Nucleic acid binder design. Structure first.
Lengths: 206, 127, 151, 79, 96, 114, 98
RNA sequence: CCGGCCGGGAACUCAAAGGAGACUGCCAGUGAUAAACUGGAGGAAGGUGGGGAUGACGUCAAGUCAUCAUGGCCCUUACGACCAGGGCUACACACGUGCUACAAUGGCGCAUACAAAGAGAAGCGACCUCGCGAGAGCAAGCGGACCUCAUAAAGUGCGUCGUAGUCCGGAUUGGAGUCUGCAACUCGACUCCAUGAAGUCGGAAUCGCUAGUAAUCGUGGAUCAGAAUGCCACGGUGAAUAC
C-alpha cells in the first residue's frame, strides 16, 4: 500500500477544499461532524441524481451547501420542491439557517466521482468489468482528458481470488504537483463482496 | 557617520552599528569582556577587525538577540563584515577571502519520524 | 568514499596561540560537545608543561608530540584470500592525528588527579619519550618492522 | 497516601457497620467495597471482602484501622 | 465499534451534564477548609456515571477509543481519510 | 568523636561525618550543625569537646541508631503479622510498592537463580 | 481605536478580504493604519497512517491560521455604518471589537 | 520615576504578503568540434546548495474481518445487554528497546549569561500570603506577536570534595504527606525525612552516525481529570574520520 491520495497532495497547489469555513477549536469538531451528517444525508438522498461534489461553507452562522451534480433537473425537480425540502432537512441537521445551490457538472464523463459511480453501478448490475472500464476510458478520452486511468480491484467476475486489472490511456502524471488530476473512488457492493473502483482523470498541466 | 550590518548565525541576529572612533565594543549595553568575554572565543567578534586593524579606528554599538553563545558571536562577526561598508568594496576583496562575508547557513536539522533525532536511527535487533 | 572524493572543513585556530594544530588537539580531547572544558584542560596542562620544561608553550608541545608520531603503520589487505598486515607510510595529517589520539588516550589511561595533570604528565613523559604513547608508537613500529617483508 | 480531607468508606458499608455493631456481631458481611478505610467502630466484626471471585472473611483487629479493606483480601493466587 | 459502547458513551454524557456541573458543586465548595460533618463526602451516591472522568472521547464517526484527536473529534484514521478528501478545512500535508 | 553510639567518624567535614549516624542524612545533619551553632565545613579534629557534646545533645533529639533500627523492624513486623498485601508482599521477598515483577525486580528479589 | 482582527486559513482569501475592508474604510471614513500581519499559527498533527501496527509510517499535517490587523483610527459614523453588513468573505473570522 | 518607561520615530531586528536570486549563466582546460567533467571568478548560496513532501510495474496468497465497510459461515432467553468486584500491573525465568549510572572533562553549595518552538476557557492561571517542599488561599490578565504555562540547562566565576564504593550512584524499604479523581488496597503521580543495593566501563557478539551530523544539554506538545525514562517537535554547545 503505497501511493498518496492525489487530491490531498494538491490541496494548496491546484485543488480546492470541499469545506471552506473558518472555526476556532471550540466548534471545529462540531462543524466538522455536522458536515459529515449533511454529506452523509445528502449523498444518500441523491443517489440517483449523479452527484459529484458537495461543498460546504459557513458564512456567519449559516450553511451554504453547493451540490456539484450532473443532472441538476432531477435535483431541483418540477418547481423546486425538492430543493426547499433538502434545505429544510439540512437546516434540521446543521441547526443553522441553510442555503443550498446547484452547480451543473457538464461533461459528466470527465468527473471521477461520476465515472467511479458509473462503473460501480454497472458492476452491481452484473455486467462484465472489462466493458465498464474500457467504455469509461474510451468515452472519457473522447472529450478532452489528457489522461485517464481506471482501476477496479477485488474478486472481479465472482472469482475466488482477487485481481486488479487497471487500464489507462493518455498521460496521467501523478508525481507532478501542478497536474490537475481529478481522482475519486467508489465501492461496488456485489453479491460476491466489495469491488473497489478508483479513477484518475488528468485534465491539464496547471 | 553611522554604518549598519545585519549579521545572523543559527537563530541569532546581531545589529552592528559602526561610528569612527576608539576601539570599544558595546554589546546590549554591556562590554565585550562582560557579555560573553568571560567565555569561549570572544576572538571571533574581533577577527573582522584584524583584517585591517581596529586599534583606535571605530566604536561599534552592537545589539544581538536569539541563539546561544557561539551563535550570537558568529552573528556579530557576520554583522561587522556586513557593516564594513564604512570603507568601500576594497575590504570585501580580502574580507571575502577570509570567508567572513559568507552567511554560515548551517541550521539544526529537523527531527524526522521514526528516528530518535535528526539522523540517529534507533538500534535494530537481531537481523 | 565509495565514489565521493571529499574536501575538508577549516577549523578555527586556537584562541590563545593561533595554532590549528593545537585546535585539533582540543577537538581530540573534547567529549560531549563541551569545548570550553577541553580548552581549559589544554591551557592548564600545556601551561604547566611550559612552566615545567621551561622551553615555551607549543614547542614543548611540538617536541612532546614529535616523539609519538608514527613513521609507518600496518594495514590489512585481504587480496590473495589471506590476511596480510602490510606496512604503509602514514600521511602527515594522519601522522599528527594519530599522535594526538595516542597522547589523549594514554592521558585518559593515567591515574593522576586532574586531566590537566594527567595530560601534562603524559606530554612530559613524552618529551623524554618514556610514556605510554611512545610505547604505542614503538608497538606500531614493531608491527611494521616485523612485517617489513610486504611492499 | 491520599486524602487530606476525610478517609473513605462507602455509605452502604457505613450503614451495615452501624447496624452490625448495634445488633451485635452475628454474621460476616458481604462487602464488595474494597475502596473503604477501616474505622475503629469496625473492630471485632467479620467482614468478608470480595477478591474478584470469593468473599474472604476478615476479622478486624485494632491495628487494621489505618488501612483499606482490600489489603486483607488478595486477588491473585500465586503458588 | 460495538453499538452498545457508543450507547454507553451517550449515557455517560447525559448523566454527566444532568447531575454534575450542578452537584459537582459539592466536591468544589463543601470539601474545603470551612468547618466538619462527614456528610457531603458521603453524598457521592450520585450514579457514578455523572462523573465526567468516565467519558472516553471516542471517535465521532466510528466510536474508536484509541487514537482520538480532540481538535477534529475523530480518530486518526478518519482524520486522514477526511483530510485527504478535503472536508477538513485548512488542513494539508506538512513539510518543513 | 564517639557520638550517638559507637559511631566514631573523623578527618572529614562535620556535615558529612555526621551522616555516618544511622538516621541522619544531609538535611538532618545541616539541622544538627545549625542547631548546635557549628560551621558546616569544620572537621572533628579541630573541634572542641564541649563542642562535641553540644553535637551529642543535638543528635539525641532525633530517633537514631538502635531506636530507629527497631522502629523500622517493628513497622515491617506489624505489616507481616497483619498479613496485608504489603505484608505478604514483604514476606515473600517481592517488591512492595506496586512495581514490575515480570522483569526487573532484582534489588528486592536478588540475583537470578538458575 | 477600532481594531478589526481577521483570521483565515487561506492567505489569498484573507488579504483579499482585508484589502476590501481597508479600501472600504479609508474610502468612506479616514485614518486606517494598514494590514499588519501578526504571526501565522501553524498547528501540526502527526497521525499514524496505518490501521494496525507500523508506528514508523506517519503522516504529518498542519493548519495555518493567518491573522491580519487593521486598527482603524477615526470613529466616523459613515465608516461604522458602511463597515457593517459588507464582508463577502466565507472563510474569514472578523473581530470588530472597539 | 532609567525599565521602550513615555512623547515619538519608522531606519533596524522582526512579523507576513509580494518580488529578485542559482540556470553549468560567465571564463580556462580536457572531451566525438557532443554530452559532460575538472578548476576559476562573481555571489548569501555552485553545481540535484541543506532538509522534507513526493515512494514506478510488481514481490511477500506480508499486516489488519478489532477503526471502518464487507461475501459466506455461526450465536440470536445468547457468542446479545446492564451492573459491582477482579484482571489486563500476576513472576523460578529468557529476549527486545530505552533511562540512570559506575564519576574529578565530575559531585555539591553560592552567584551569573545566552534560546527556539509550542499550548491555553470544564483551560493557562500572574502578583501577594501561608507551607522545608509537593502544594494551599485570595485571585489579576489572557481565547491570546499583549497574559499565563515559563526559571532554559549544559556554560561561566568562586569555594569544597579528593580517588574513597567515596560528598559517585540512586535502586529498595520504613515513616510523614500534597494533588487529581465517587474512589490511589490490588493499581497513580509528586514531595519531605530516613535507608542507601547492584554497579569501578561491561564475555561471545552487536548497533547508529559523513556536518550543525554523531555526542551531549535542556524546552514544548498530542493522548490526558490524574498518570511518560515512550512518541512527535524545538533549540544550546558541538566533534572525529573517510587511504
Amino acid at each position: 500500500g503505497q501511493k498518496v491520495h492525489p487530491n490531498g497532495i494538491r490541496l494548496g497547489i491546484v485543488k480546492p477544499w470541499n469545506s471552506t469555513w473558518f472555526a476556532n477549536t471550540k466548534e471545529f469538531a462540531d462543524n466538522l461532524d455536522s458536515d459529515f451528517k449533511v454529506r452523509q444525508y445528502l449523498t444518500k438522498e441523491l443517489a440517483k441524481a449523479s452527484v459529484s461534489r458537495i461543498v460546504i461553507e459557513r458564512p456567519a452562522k449559516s450553511i451554504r451547501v453547493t451540490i456539484h451534480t450532473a443532472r441538476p433537473g432531477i435535483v431541483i425537480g418540477k418547481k423546486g420542491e425538492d430543493v426547499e425540502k433538502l434545505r429544510k432537512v439540512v437546516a434540521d441537521i446543521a441547526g443553522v439557517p441553510a442555503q443550498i445551490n446547484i452547480a451543473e457538472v457538464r461533461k459528466p464523463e470527465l468527473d471521477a466521482k461520476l465515472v467511479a459511480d458509473s462503473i460501480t453501478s454497472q458492476l452491481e448490475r452484473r455486467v462484465m468489468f472489462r466493458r465498464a472500464m474500457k467504455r469509461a476510458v474510451q468515452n472519457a478520452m473522447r472529450l478532452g482528458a489528457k489522461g485517464i486511468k481506471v482501476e477496479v480491484s477485488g474478486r472481479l467476475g465472482g472469482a475466488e481470488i482477487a485481481r486488479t486489472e487497471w487500464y489507462r490511456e493518455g498521460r496521467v502524471p501523478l508525481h507532478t504537483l501542478r497536474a490537475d488530476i481529478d481522482y475519486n473512488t467508489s465501492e461496488a457492493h456485489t453479491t460476491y463482496g466489495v469491488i473497489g473502483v478508483k479513477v484518475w482523470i488528468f485534465k491539464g498541466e496547471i | 557617520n553611522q554604518y549598519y550590518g545585519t549579521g545572523r548565525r543559527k537563530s541569532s541576529a546581531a545589529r552592528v552599528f559602526i561610528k569612527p572612533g576608539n576601539g570599544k565594543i558595546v554589546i546590549n549595553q554591556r562590554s565585550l569582556e562582560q557579555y560573553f568575554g568571560r567565555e569561549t572565543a570572544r576572538m571571533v567578534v574581533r577577527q573582522p577587525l584584524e583584517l585591517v586593524d581596529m586599534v583606535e579606528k571605530l566604536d561599534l554599538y552592537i545589539t544581538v538577540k536569539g541563539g546561544g553563545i557561539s551563535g550570537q558571536a558568529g552573528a556579530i562577526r557576520h554583522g561587522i563584515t556586513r557593516a564594513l561598508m564604512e570603507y568601500d568594496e576594497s575590504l570585501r576583496s580580502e574580507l571575502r577571502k577570509a570567508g567572513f562575508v559568507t552567511r554560515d547557513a548551517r541550521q539544526v536539522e529537523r527531527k524526522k519520524v521514526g528516528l530518535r533525532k535528526a539522523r540517529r536511527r534507533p538500534q535494530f535487533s537481531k537481523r | 568514499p565509495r565514489r565521493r572524493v571529499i574536501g575538508q572543513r577549516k577549523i578555527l585556530p586556537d584562541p590563545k596561540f593561533g595554532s590549528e594544530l593545537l585546535a585539533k588537539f582540543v577537538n581530540i580531547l573534547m567529549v560531549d560537545g563541551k569545548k570550553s572544558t577541553a580548552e581549559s584542560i589544554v591551557y592548564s596542562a600545556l601551561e604547566t608543561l611550559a612552566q615545567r620544561s621551561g622551553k615555551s608553550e607549543l614547542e614543548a608541545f611540538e617536541v612532546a608530540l614529535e616523539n609519538v608520531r608514527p613513521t609507518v603503520e600496518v594495514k590489512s589487505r585481504r587480496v590473495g584470500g589471506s590476511t596480510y598486515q602490510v606496512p604503509v607510510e602514514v600521511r602527515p595529517v594522519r601522522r599528527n592525528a594519530l599522535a594526538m589520539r595516542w597522547i589523549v588516550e594514554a592521558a585518559r589511561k593515567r591515574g593522576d588527579k586532574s586531566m590537566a595533570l594527567r595530560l601534562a604528565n603524559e606530554l612530559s613523559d613524552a618529551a623524554e619519550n618514556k610514556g605510554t604513547a611512545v610505547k604505542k608508537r614503538e608497538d606500531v613500529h614493531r608491527m611494521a618492522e616485523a612485517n617489513k617483508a610486504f611492499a | 497516601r491520599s486524602l487530606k480531607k476525610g478517609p473513605f468508606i462507602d455509605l452502604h458499608l457505613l450503614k451495615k457497620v452501624e447496624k452490625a455493631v448495634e445488633s451485635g456481631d452475628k454474621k460476616p458481611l458481604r462487602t464488595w467495597s474494597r475502596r473503604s478505610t477501616i474505622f475503629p467502630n469496625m473492630i471485632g466484626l467479620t467482614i468478608a471482602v470480595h477478591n474478584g471471585r470469593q468473599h474472604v472473611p476478615v476479622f478486624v483487629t485494632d491495628e487494621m484501622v489505618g488501612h483499606k479493606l482490600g489489603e486483607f483480601a488478595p486477588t491473585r493466587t500465586y503458588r | 465499534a460495538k453499538q452498545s459502547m457508543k450507547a454507553r458513551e451517550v449515557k455517560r454524557v447525559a448523566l454527566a451534564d444532568k447531575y454534575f456541573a450542578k452537584r459537582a458543586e459539592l466536591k468544589a465548595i463543601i470539601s474545603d477548609v470551612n468547618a466538619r460533618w462527614n456528610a457531603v463526602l458521603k453524598l457521592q451516591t450520585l450514579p457514578r456515571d455523572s462523573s465526567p472522568s468516565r467519558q472516553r472521547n471516542r471517535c465521532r464517526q466510528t466510536g474508536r477509543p484509541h487514537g482520538f484527536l480532540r481538535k477534529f473529534g475523530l480518530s486518526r484514521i478518519k482524520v486522514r481519510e477526511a483530510a485527504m478528501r478535503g472536508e477538513i478545512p485548512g488542513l494539508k500535508k506538512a513539510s518543513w | 568523636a564517639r557520638i550517638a553510639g559507637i559511631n566514631i567518624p573523623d578527618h572529614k567535614h562535620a556535615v558529612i561525618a555526621l551522616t555516618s549516624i544511622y538516621g541522619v542524612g544531609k538535611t538532618r545533619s545541616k539541622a544538627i550543625l545549625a542547631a548546635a551553632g557549628i560551621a558546616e565545613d569544620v572537621k572533628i579534629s579541630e573541634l572542641s569537646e564541649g563542642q562535641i557534646d553540644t553535637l551529642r545533645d543535638e543528635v539525641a533529639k532525633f530517633v537514631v541508631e538502635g531506636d530507629l533500627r527497631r522502629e523500622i523492624s517493628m513497622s515491617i513486623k506489624r505489616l507481616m503479622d497483619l498479613g496485608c498485601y504489603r505484608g505478604l508482599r514483604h514476606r515473600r521477598g517481592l517488591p512492595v510498592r506496586g512495581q514490575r515483577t515480570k522483569t526487573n525486580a532484582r534489588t528486592r528479589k536478588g540475583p537470578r537463580k538458575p | 481605536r477600532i481594531r478589526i482582527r481577521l483570521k483565515a486559513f487561506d492567505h489569498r482569501l484573507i488579504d483579499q478580504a482585508t484589502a476590501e475592508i481597508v479600501e472600504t474604510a479609508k474610502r468612506t471614513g479616514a485614518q486606517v493604519r494598514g494590514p499588519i500581519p501578526l504571526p501565522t499559527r501553524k498547528e501540526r498533527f502527526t497521525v499514524l497512517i496505518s490501521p494496525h501496527v507500523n508506528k514508523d509510517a506517519r503522516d504529518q499535517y498542519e493548519i495555518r491560521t493567518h491573522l491580519r490587523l487593521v486598527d482603524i483610527v477615526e470613529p466616523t459614523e459613515k465608516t461604522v455604518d458602511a463597515l457593517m453588513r459588507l464582508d463577502l468573505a466565507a472563510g474569514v473570522d472578523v473581530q470588530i471589537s472597539l
